[PDB]
Symmetry: D5
Subunit: 194 residues, 10 copies
């Protein structure tokens, strides 16, 4: 599986602050967590709500040492045209993170989210830790938007267990909730408490 292993590296053109840049995924290793989400096409319907939802809460991810990266098979010129469209008109407005262009579809293919039939990507999202290892996947069919909240929760759980490597996070864990020690003897400390 992809989860539990190093992410497939890529180097691609992207749009950031309405300028054309390059983004190399491995360049974030050692530096930040990465939330990499794919969406099907520019100028669609669920996709702008996801993209701007993540843009509006980007400060929360930046303060948690996490970068957000959006990817679709569109070119950087579609990306740029869409950034310059008003949100009220179905556009994106200005974005707080890079919009990555996968024109060759190799990135979507390497993450297993490419629908070969249609040449577009599913709504797949991947949380990558500072060592470059994929720790989480959410993959939705095209009609169902994802959740910034659940992405935030999963990310906080990952950072929590990586700072306290002797803990694991129970179902529904939030910051402030009790964790547990994955040990037949010490986990009882949790199981008695409830």
């Amino acid at each position: 599986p992809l989860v539990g292993n190093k992410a497939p590296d890529f180097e691609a053109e992207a749009v950031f602050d309405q300028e054309f840049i390059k983004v190399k995924l491995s360049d974030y290793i050692g530096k930040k967590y990465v939330i990499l989400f794919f969406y099907p096409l520019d100028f669609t319907f669920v996709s702008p709500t996801e993209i701007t939802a993540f843009s509006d809460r980007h400060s929360e991810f930046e303060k948690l040492n996490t970068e957000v990266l959006g990817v679709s098979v569109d070119s950087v010129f579609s990306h740029l045209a869409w950034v310059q469209t008003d949100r009220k008109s179905g556009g994106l407005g200005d974005l707080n993170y890079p919009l990555i262009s996968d024109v060759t579809k190799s990135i979507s293919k390497s993450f297993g989210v490419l629908i070969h039939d249609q040449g577009i990507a599913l709504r797949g999202l991947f949380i990558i830790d500072k060592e470059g290892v994929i720790q989480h996947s959410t993959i939705n069919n095209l009609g169902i938007g994802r959740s910034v909240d659940e992405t935030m929760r999963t990310l906080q759980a990952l950072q929590y267990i990586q700072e306290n490597p002797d803990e694991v996070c129970p179902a529904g864990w939030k910051p402030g909730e009790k964790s547990m020690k994955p040990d037949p003897k010490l986990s009882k400390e949790y199981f008695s408490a409830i």
Copy 2:
């Protein structure tokens, strides 16, 4: 990819009501939505919290015409032993849904959740509709527990767009929130309504 296609069928033994039964995944086609979640091993730590979290809210899924199915590579005798252990002792107590045994590991293989190094499954969860099609995938590494709330949300979004085939669900959609029509002309109806 798995999402967007018919689920790989299986027929496997399971523990239900402390009895041994058989479960065939395709038997739910035409009848119920399926939430199929894998966990690594019996007598572990995050896994019991996931299993009982879903069991305690099983009635809510039952009201939504959805069955929950837990799967791991352990045998049905380990499953039965774990159900008969108290929750206070790290056990499951009584379960409201079948615990399926993937003893040959073929089910985990077909859903791409098997860590071949270790012979156990990742924390993969799959939502399957009444036609047997996978519509949602959640896959966590072994240490991070999942969320029954987000599973409930995604399942409800799927049911909404399947009853209203002209709608799609925006980011963060919950029941009661506005959806939109995936049409460049009718989408403006949703878009020109956000201050």
Copy 3:
């Protein structure tokens, strides 16, 4: 070669009069000549000048029983967004012919104009006769715009020799110019005249 043989058939989504339609190339067989031109990407620079140039002279092609079809690897949503952009802003405005979407890149691949490196098509143009046979190719690198005039000339020559199957068109032939009979004995009638 592609030229001299039946065009590779396709069925694809397209934008026409700002609506989503389907276009099947073989459906024009027996009905009209087809001028099929590929361009690299939506929201570029030479491409809008080519697309609108052909749009403005579309009546000349319609009166000659010829349809124009543009193709790129962009989706119909980019196509539609670009049609709804003003020409003064680098957009296309309203188009007189369909804009075809090759999201899977199979069409560009089958016509041999796909740059595999970049996932976009070269500036290839193909004139297809009423039997579906490719009779002409113009393929330019990305920086050089094509010519509506030379396309018109080549098309008029093709229709001329197909109406008078005993004639062929010399270099630079225009309507009104003398043709010749490709026959060792009758071609002399041309060669003496000049």
Copy 4:
């Protein structure tokens, strides 16, 4: 595709000034632009009009640092026989550029213009820059003559954008017309200037 890449090199005999010479395509790299055009056969009909049309305007290409090269599958003895036939008799008369013999058909094969059924080349024309890279392709079926004017236009556009690497040539561009900068911000300078 051929366009956008280095041309397939060849070394072949040719007729020039009614003498037998050798021509190596890569020998023009670093020195001149190359217009390489194929024609099907000697002693035919459209082909002599193309060949002499280019010969009569050869001086214009020579002024543009460009050589013209004609190629067909005929031998150099047929080529020489055709040059020595009067134009009034369907011949070539004197030619200003080499006529290359593709007797083994390997050159036509490498440029994708060989009709394998018939063993002759289509009316393919290729523009090659000083680095040896194909920048333009014209391929006609056997009955439709080509245009020296459009070849001149495309060659001049190529030379313009290669001397001005920040420019691109719009549709129908001729020398003296405005070009544009392929940049979403600087392109508006061209676009907001057309009534």
Copy 5:
């Protein structure tokens, strides 16, 4: 065949004294004989009688410089749960030897005891000498328990012929019985009696 050759080596997790340890089979080479037995699954019926049967007599095997190793496809968490159950409740109680986990099933596969249809091992038992060579195999279908007595007999025969490499053991040989020299001329001393 497996018997007569070096055992397929493995490194696996196991439960011993209610702790998780590692066991590498080649680590016993030069040190002890190994009695390596597979059983199908934890929390079953015949298997606990075999496992505890070997545990109760482990001192007899240890005095013979022999270690016992139990293996099944269950994880160490099932193994530990089963050890921490009393024998009266269907458990194993405390064991005198390691319970090995073959969670990937590769060990059962390499010893040819994996029923691929069912993903569990047959009741296969292997006697391995100090050089790491398989000398004996007992493989039962799931319903028939094995016998610690016959394992002890076979191990004693193997140890006898390895300490007296010029002897071989006749049918039913027990310590104290006559052996014979596998030689046409010297066997006659045995058959004449």
Copy 6:
């Protein structure tokens, strides 16, 4: 694996009552249990003690509806020459069961007991039930003789659990000892002899 599946069928010549006969293994299906044991070579040392040991107790197996079959890679002419040798001279004397000749070695090969290096069989023994399914394997290296007593115990346990299909035999079970009637709880929808075997 071989155990748990139908035995590989064979048809071979054999020595019985000092005459050359044919034996087809599938012919015992429906009729008798089979104790099929291999030994490496004729005129050896452990092998005659095993062979005569089984012949001397053959009546006990006959009363249990069981036939014994010995197999080796020697020909029937070796088998007959060895049967006609006195036991005091290392021979077999007359035997109560057939001695099967595996000259082409395909039989040893199909049962996985052929040492390819040496062209002889290990001391493999196989207990086969009335449906032809191998239920037990004992495979010894060449120097260690087998036990007729343990073969009898395993055979008796197999016959017990097949006659009482709800029972299983614990470790070390002998006739007269308690068996086990396990009670895996299957639902009645599933209920219509697998799980009590583990």
Copy 7:
């Protein structure tokens, strides 16, 4: 080998009487012997002497129920241009037999006369009987012209042995010379003389 077997059939365009025709080699089966000769290229030097040499003596071959076919890799347009040139200007003038175009080079390839390096045929000549069988091959390198006399001699020998199938032709046989019967006992009549 080609000699002794049916010729590779072909259908090709040719020039005859300054007109474009088609020639299919199997169309001559049952009707005429075929003298099929290849030459390298049109507008050369040895080749016209061979082509016109055969043309000037075509009546001698036609009286023997034999057609001559010339083949080169040039097109019919080169062929026609060369025919319409006078012999005094290096041309062929009018020809008594078809000039075949092997523009795809497949015919030369199938008769093994194609020099692949140069894309032209050697000076190969083949005599084909009324059943379509190759009976004789003459293959020269480019600088040595062939001989119409030896072609006539070989054709006359082949026709002789096919009309008298019990005879064979000795070395240098011409019409009027003694033949022999290929038989150990009847050959003696020949060798005794």
Copy 8:
């Protein structure tokens, strides 16, 4: 094709002066032209007339720095038996050149004259120049004898154009007839013996 390229080399036993010798074809390179002719079998009918015809005119070839070599699939013992047979009896008598034995048939095979159906060679003749390059081929079916006169003509034409490397021989050329000095117009940059050959 064979013609225009170096001959396939061979080394074979042969009969010469009623003794067994060896012949290696590459040994003539730099030294003599070679007329290498195959015939199907010894003790036949067209073949002796060809063989004796070449032997009787061998001096004419010797004076032209040319060796003749006959080859067939028969052994040297057949060749010697046939040489020792009188010509009036269908034999060869003594020969002026070696008779080469192709018992393994590799020689006939390398020259493409082996009828695989029958294991014998067609009446193939090959003229090889001093550099070892085949310049001419005549291949007759088994019933048609070849012509020593035409071999002489072709050989003389080859020697002429190789001694006068600017000339070529028209159709039917004989010594004394006009040759041709063609004048293909190559540029002096290209000018430093191909094109006048066509």
Copy 9:
């Protein structure tokens, strides 16, 4: 092995009574035993002595329902020339049996006696019964001639056991000698009389 199986069939031209015939090996099945011997080459040295030895004793084989067949890779014309050569001159003289020509060497190849290095056959001899099955092979290197006496003995033993299918022939068996019954209990008749 060849011995014990049907001989590889062939059809080949041969010389018999100084005439050309065809010989098909399977045509002797049911009719005669066959002694098929190969020799290396015509006009050699050991081979003529073998061939004439078999011809001189051919009547003894004919009375035993046996044909002799000699085979070498030479043609029928070499064979005929050699038959018409006097024995004092190294020839064969008149032959009582056919001389078969294996020009394509397929026969020598199928009986495994062809020296591929040299294209000739070894001194292999095969005794074939009326059913077409090879019962004996003798294969000598080129310098060691074979023995007609031993061929007659082997043939006579084969005919004996095929006439008395319950008997087998001990070492050195000749007509008049004791046979034995290949049975443990019946062979005692032969064994007990050993002196």
Copy 10:
């Protein structure tokens, strides 16, 4: 073919003087001629007569620098049991040469005498010279015993021509008989004396 080439080497256990030895065929190279004969099985019927026939005349072969080697697929224990059986009882009695055991059947396989159907060897016999090259093979089907006399004759002829490398042995050659020189002109000495 095997005849004319180095024999396939082997190393095998054998019985000699009622002891177990090892025998390596290449160890006889340079030292002795080898008569290597296969027989089908121990305790059979033709085979003991062959084995004892060779043992009884072994001294004649020993004086000719020749060893005898018998081979069958039986084990050395069958071999020893058979040697220790009386000849009147179908046994061998004491043997003058080694009995080799081919239990894995590789030796019979490499000499082409193994009947794969039955796993036993044919009655194949091979004469091997001091250089290790097979010069003669006799292969009989199971019922026809071989001849020690013909083996001695073939061996004596081989030794004769290897001692006189300019001679070859005609058909039926025995010591004292005329040889011949395999040369067209020298063979006339033999041929001209034919009566």
